[PDB]
Structures are given as C-alpha cells and as structure tokens.
Amino acid sequence: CRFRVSVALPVGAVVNCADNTGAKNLYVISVKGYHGRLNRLPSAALGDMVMCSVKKGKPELRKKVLNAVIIRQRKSWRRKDGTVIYFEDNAGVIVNPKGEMKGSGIAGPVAKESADLWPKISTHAPAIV
C-alpha cells in the first residue's frame, strides 16, 4: 500500500474536520488494521481509516460512530528520499466504509501519502503537498 509513516494520533485524540459536512471535531475511537499488543494504544498516521465521532458540530451527525481518513499531521515523518516534512495541524475527512467522501470540498492541502491510497479524495484536494 505505502511506506511507513510515524504514528501520530493515539486513541482519544481530537482532530479538525476539513470537509464541509457541518462537523468541527473528530474523536479517534480506533484504527482499522491494528493488530493488538499488550498495553499499547492504537495510533493513526496519514492515509489511515479511523472510527471517529463528532464532538462539536451539527446535531444531526453527533452521537454516533462514523468513518474518517487522516490527511494532515503535526508529527514529522521521513520520506524515502530523506526529506523530513510536517504540517501545522491535524486534520481528517469523513468518508464511507468504502472510501467515498461525504461532503464536496476540502479546506487545506492534503498529503500525497494519503492521496495515493484514496483516489476519490485526491479529486477534491485543493493541493497535494
């Protein structure tokens, strides 16, 4: 799928929502594809699908479990060509279980590591960086 990205967002983190669905927060509940290990919290990185919940936003999508994709992170990661890069904030986008993106626009830039895995997001991305 992709190379390695340093894990950034353990369970319990709150990240911004970059879509235009009315949500303002996302609360990380778990990470898809995590195999367990004793005492270790599951953590997410770019291009991951997470189970989330809205903590502040429109009341019609609030007290339930949803899916989201991470597109930005403050923790820096190293690319194969030896460049270290990081963003200014953590962000996410609400999607389908199959990857189709609820909403029709994205606010800031998105990372190539997450635009490669999800082709529907890269269509609405305003810049791939």
Binding site: R2, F3, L38, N39, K80, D81, G82
Partner: protein
C-alpha cells in the same frame, strides 16, 4: 505477551578478544579456483549517499533514495605462514606450520609486552636454522605432509600498522589471524599459499564492488546495566516503595530457586556478533594514487572521502577503504573482519548493481552546510584575519 530478549545470545558476558574472529568459513567448493575468504579493516565513521533505485514493480523504482553508509579503512595485509589440518574422529588437528624467511618488526612485536626494553630475540634461531641445510629438508617434509594428509589449508596474515598512519589507534603490534583458502584441490591450495608468502594482498583482490559480505566484530561496551536497559522490561508505577526500575516477581514458590530465563542486572555491551549480508557500495583507492575519491559521474566536484574537519575522534583516511551500506557493531578505531557470505545470494536486492550519484562530505561537527572549503570561502569573503595577514606580508 512474548518474553523479553533472546535466549540464544546468553551468557551476556564480556568477549574474550577485542578483534572479530570468524567462527566458521563458507563451504569449500573444489570446482572453483583457489582464493582467500577474509580481510581485516578499521572503522572510521558514517555518512550518507544518494542513489537511483532499479527495482521493478516498486513505488520507489526509478527514483532517488538517501542511504546511510559506514566507511572502513583497509591497508594491505602481509602473509607470513601456512597451516594445514587433518580430520580425526575427534576434530580437526593441525599438522604444522611453515614460516616465511623474513618477518617484520610489527609482526614480532605481538610476542612482547615491552618490546623496546627487551632483547628482541624472537624467531632468531628459526631464521638461522631455516637458512641452514637441514631447514630446507624440514620445510619440504612439512609441505609433503600437507599434500598427503590434509583437508584444510589456511594462511597466517597480519596488518601493517605503520601503513595506517593513525594517531588515535594506539597499538603498534600487528593483529594476526588465519584466513582459509577455498577452491581447488589441496595441491592447488598449497601452490597458491606458497606463491603468496611474504607478499602483500589488497582488499580488492578479495572483494568486488557490488557483492555482499558478513562482518565479525565486538559491540560497544556499557558496563553494568539494570534490567530495564539490559533486557527491556517495563518500569513500575510512580507510587512504588523501594524503586521502579526492577522486575517485580522473579519466580514462583515452586521450583524453589531462580531460573536461568529471568532478567537480572550485569554486563551490557562488548559481545561478539556476525551481522549477515552487508552490501558493499564502493571500493576506494588511496588518496595518494587517486585524490578524487568522492567524485561521481553526476557530481563533478573534486573531493576526497574525509569530511570537513575530519572524522570525529578518528582523523583522516589515508589508505584504501570500503563503503558498506548501513551500520556495523563497534565504535570507531576498532578492528573488524570481513568474510565472504554464507547465506544464499539469489535475491533481487542482493543481485542489484549499485551506481552512486552523491556522497556527503560536509562537517560532522555541528550542522554542516558546506561540501568543500572552496564553497565555504565562496560564501564568506576575505575576513579581518585575512586582511591583516596580507598587510603584514606586504610590510
């Protein structure tokens, strides 16, 4: 949970030697031609390179990557003896050894604890007797014994420490080791060994540019260490009487003793390891013969392999060197052994051919932003010291 650590690397005790020693040699194939299987080098330091990857069906294929490397300095080696072994129902037993006619002061220094304040009598009777007529008879008898009742041939080689003009490596007595001869029949092995007696061999006659190798070396020492850093167990909660950095339960009531599988405190570091499959990226010649060592086809800058300000704690690299991908066990200045690989070498990665595009030679002190002294001068200009020196020279 799985257990902490590997029980196949016990006892975690200090090594018996400081040099790396090959416990086994690659299997002998009589179809090939006779050759040597080992070499001793000295660790200098680390840097990184840039390289374009040829790996079909990869997300990095046809793209550039940055890979760290380690530099090991390899002056030539001198052969001084031949040994043979015979197989017995209880193991290999050595038959005898055939010494060269002349040895060097640095080889004979290895037999003394205080060479300068001594009579320096080593190998004198041997030299006289070898010159005499019965000495030739004895040598011929030993060589015939090899040719008739041997299965393994090894040569005795040593390092030339006066060729390696290093100020931080303090030792003046040579390091001695046995290198096996592989390939061919026993007669052919003996012929090659006799041809290489009192002669110097180079690392490029043993290894080629894009092959792989194994490394035998001794790890960096750390002294007595506790269980948290020695074995990797978990710390205990802040609210703990008598300390947090311990193992809580060291056994059950029965058996009524401590088992060998439980973590205790003691020596960490200074162990021997063999480190399979280190791909070699470049074999460089001496800076006397070729002064443009770190120059490539893509980068035409004239530079050597030593960084600005020198390798930290080691100095300048003055002889031939080997560039290995990754890391090796041990600190700088330690002697190491390079061995021909034992594992199969049929992987695409192990068969790829390497072409370097860039080699970093910036300073390892602080953050380096200049590749060369000419570049540093170009950035700055004439400084106040330069102006006053020119003025003083004028007047």
């Amino acid at each position: 949970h799985p257990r902490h650590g590997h029980l196949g690397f016990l006892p975690r005790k200090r090594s018996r030697q400081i040099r790396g020693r090959a416990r086994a040699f690659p299997k002998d194939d009589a179809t090939q031609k006779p050759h040597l299987t080992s070499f001793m080098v000295f660790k200098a330091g680390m840097t990184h390179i840039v390289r374009d990857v040829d790996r079909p069906g990869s997300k990095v294929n046809k793209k550039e990557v940055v890979e760290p490397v380690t530099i090991l300095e390899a002056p030539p080696m001198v052969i001084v003896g031949i040994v043979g072994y015979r197989q017995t129902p209880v193991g290999l037993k050595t038959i005898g050894t055939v010494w060269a006619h002349h040895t060097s002061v640095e080889f004979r220094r290895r037999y003394y604890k205080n060479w300068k304040q001594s009579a320096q009598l080593a190998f004198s009777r041997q030299k006289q007797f070898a010159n005499t007529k019965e000495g030739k008879v004895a040598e011929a008898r030993t060589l015939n014994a090899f040719a008739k009742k041997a299965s393994v041939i090894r040569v005795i080689a040593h390092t030339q420490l006066r060729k390696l003009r290093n100020h931080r490596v303090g030792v003046k007595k040579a390091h001695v080791q046995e290198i096996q001869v592989n390939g061919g029949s026993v007669a052919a092995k003996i012929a090659l060994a006799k041809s290489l007696l009192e002669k110097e061999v180079r690392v490029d006659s043993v290894f080629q540019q894009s092959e792989a190798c194994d490394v035998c070396s001794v790890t960096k020492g750390h002294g007595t260490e506790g269980v948290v850093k020695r074995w990797g167990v978990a710390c205990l909660p802040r609210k703990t009487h008598r300390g947090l950095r311990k193992v809580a339960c060291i056994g059950a009531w029965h058996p009524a003793r401590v088992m060998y599988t439980v973590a205790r405190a003691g020596q960490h570091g200074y162990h021997h390891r063999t480190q399979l499959n280190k791909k070699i990226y470049q074999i460089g010649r001496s800076v006397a013969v070729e002064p443009n060592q770190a120059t490539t086809t893509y980068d035409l800058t004239a530079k050597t392999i030593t960084p600005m300000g020198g390798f930290v704690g080691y100095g300048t690299v003055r002889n031939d060197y080997v560039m290995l991908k990754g890391s090796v066990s041990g600190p700088r200045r330690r002697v190491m052994t390079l061995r021909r690989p034992m594992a199969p070498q049929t992987s695409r990665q192990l068969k790829e051919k390497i072409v370097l595009k860039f080699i970093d030679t910036s300073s390892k002190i602080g953050h380096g932003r200049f590749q060369t002294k000419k570049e540093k001068n170009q950035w700055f200009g004439p400084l106040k010291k330069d102006r006053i020196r020119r003025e003083e020279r004028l007047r």
